[PDB]
Amino acid sequence: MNPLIIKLGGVLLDSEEALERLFSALVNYRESHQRPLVIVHGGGCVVDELMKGLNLPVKKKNGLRVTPADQIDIITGALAGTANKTLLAWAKKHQIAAVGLFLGDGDSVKVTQLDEELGHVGLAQPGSPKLINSLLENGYLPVVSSIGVTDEGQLMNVNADQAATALAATLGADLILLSDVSGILDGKGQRIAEMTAAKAEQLIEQGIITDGMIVKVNAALDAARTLGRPVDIASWRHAEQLPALFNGMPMGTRILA
Amino acid sequence: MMNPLIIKLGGVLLDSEEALERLFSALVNYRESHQRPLVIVHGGGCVVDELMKGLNLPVKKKNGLRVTPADQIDIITGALAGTANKTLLAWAKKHQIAAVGLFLGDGDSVKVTQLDEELGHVGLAQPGSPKLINSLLENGYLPVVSSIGVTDEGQLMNVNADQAATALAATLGADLILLSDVSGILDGKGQRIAEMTAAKAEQLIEQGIITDGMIVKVNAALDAARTLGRPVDIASWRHAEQLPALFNGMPMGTRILA
């Protein structure tokens, strides 16, 4: 099979129950299926707690965080270091041969600076699949953080949904955005298995999709629009359904755009 | 057949723009004239210390060595396996070097057990599996390995970088250079001792000739040579002029012989 990228939301990373369930599911799946799996992740709450711990206020510019030179190293530490190695420790506990990467390893996802005024915020672009392909061929589970690096050597914090999207494009991989949202329910409360961009847009306005659901649905829509194939929204809550989902079944809500 | 060279980094180097620039220039120079592949191992230098200061966290010792509390291993892992590692990867990318950042647990490259209940999450390194790193080397990548590890039960561990590098050296069958901010150890005629036996180095420490907090550094090289059964070089990262010659087998610092 073509590779699958499983992107983990921060709320998943901040929950030991989610993580235990996830890694148990990963073990179960791999005992019956050889599909190449890649994990992508961001920071979760560990960046924000570190920043608060260091009394470094976060400034925003039009909704995006200014990331000066004097914060990018701290952030890199929390996200490429703590979050990534926490995942690798979970992997090890479950006897899974994982390898931690960031976007710059093998130029897997190329990153340019988004805006001089935001400092070290990066924009993801598809990169080179060579390194990750070689790891997958050898039976490793790459676990890739959303820190990247420009070609000139400047570290960048990259939106993890976009990072995962760029990596999926790079690898010709499928994409699941996994978090606490198990699927988008219709106006009668039934999970919608497959959802076009037309339904999504209608449902938001109609008021069925509101709150954080809006941002998560939009995250998926952007990812599908770029990728040219569907992107799944799913949760860890019904852990038994994860192998099916990893095999390509729309156990969540599949977004088509 | 491969005979990789591990260059271990730490201390103030990891935070000096000029030093890193000259270090990486030397890496590129050696790589241009040699097929023998390189591996970097590194500790956390000033990066960990700096973060500890900013969080107002005390650094406590016990047997001489530093305690790594359960409530601090995540922060330390961040500074070391995150910041220091990726800083080095950024310098690699600046210098067009295809590098891959690793920690000790990746491919079980260096196995780790908890050293002491009282030190908390401080790890004792032992040789692991060379398969992952060997494959990376054969494919032309430069592995850059931090000194964080993980126990088989999944507990993160901070490992002495000198001992982590030694265990990796055993694992890969590698030559080993410990780069630190060191001076030459002089004999009674005031000339730098370029090579000395683990037996001699041990004696010079015993007889007070080996001055300063170099005792810790020589002890590290000595233990490495005895474990490895091959010579281990201690050298300065200053005067990076001499580094390619150093990498090319010349004893430009102080070699502890087997």
For chain A, the structural domain boundaries read 1-257
Q: Rounded distance, CA B155 to CA A141, Å?
A: 19
Q: Rounded distance, CA A4 to CA A57, Å?
A: 37
CB neighbourhood size of B60 (10 A): 10
Pairing outcome for strands A64-65 and A60-61: antiparallel
Q: Virtual CA dihedral for B153, B159, B164, B165, nearest 10 degrees?
A: 150
Contact A80 B82 (CB under 8 A): yes
B74 Cβ contact partners less than 8 Å away, ≥ 6 residues apart: A46, A82, A86, B156
The token pair at B36 is 């023998």
Q: Give the resolution to one decimal, in Å.
A: 2.0
CB B88 within 8 A of CB B179: no
Q: Rounded distance, CA B171 to CA B73, Å?
A: 25
The token pair at A203 is 């449902």
| A238 residue type, one letter | H
DSSP state for residue A23 in the 8-state scheme: H
CB A224 within 8 A of CB A256: yes
Bridge partner list, B192: B186
Task: Taking each helix axis as running N to C, give the angle between helix B161-172 and helix B214-228, from 0 to 180 degrees, rounded to the nearest 10.
Answer: 20
CB neighbourhood size of A51 (10 A): 17
A143 Cβ contact partners less than 8 Å away, ≥ 6 residues apart: A38, A39, A41, A84, A87, A88, A91, A98, A99, A100, A101
CATH 3.40.50.300, applies to B1-258 = no
Q: Rounded distance, CA B129 to CA A97, Å?
A: 12
- Taking CA atoms, A58 is separated from A54, A61, A65, A155, A162, in Å, by 11, 10, 7, 18, 21
Q: Which residues of A are annotated as a binding site for substrate?
A: 43-44, 65, 157
- Which residues of B lie inside 8 Å of A (Cβ-Cβ)? 47, 51, 54-55, 74-75, 77-83, 85-87, 89-91, 93-95, 98-103, 105-108, 132, 135, 139, 141, 148, 150-156
- Taking CA atoms, A128 is separated from A109, B32, B90, B101, in Å, by 7, 23, 17, 16
Q: Rounded distance, CA B39 to CA B252, Å?
A: 19
CB B118 within 8 A of CB A100: no
Bridge partner list, A174: A4
Q: Rounded distance, CA B228 to CA A56, Å?
A: 45
A101 Cβ contact partners less than 8 Å away, ≥ 6 residues apart: A108, A131, A132, A142, A143, A144, A145, B100, B101
Please name the fold of domain A1-257. Answer: Carbamate kinase (3.40.1160)
- CA-based nearest residue to A178, from A7, A30, A48, A44: A7
C-alpha distance from B177 to closest chain A C-alpha (Å): 24
| A253 residue type, one letter | T
The token pair at B103 is 């920690």
Is residue A93 among the annotated active site residues?
Answer: no
CB B97 within 8 A of CB B88: no
| B35 residue type, one letter | Q
Place of tokens 């860890």: A236
CB neighbourhood size of A185 (10 A): 15
3-state secondary structure of B180: coil
- What kind of experiment solved this structure? X-ray
Q: Is B181 part of any known ligand binding site?
A: yes
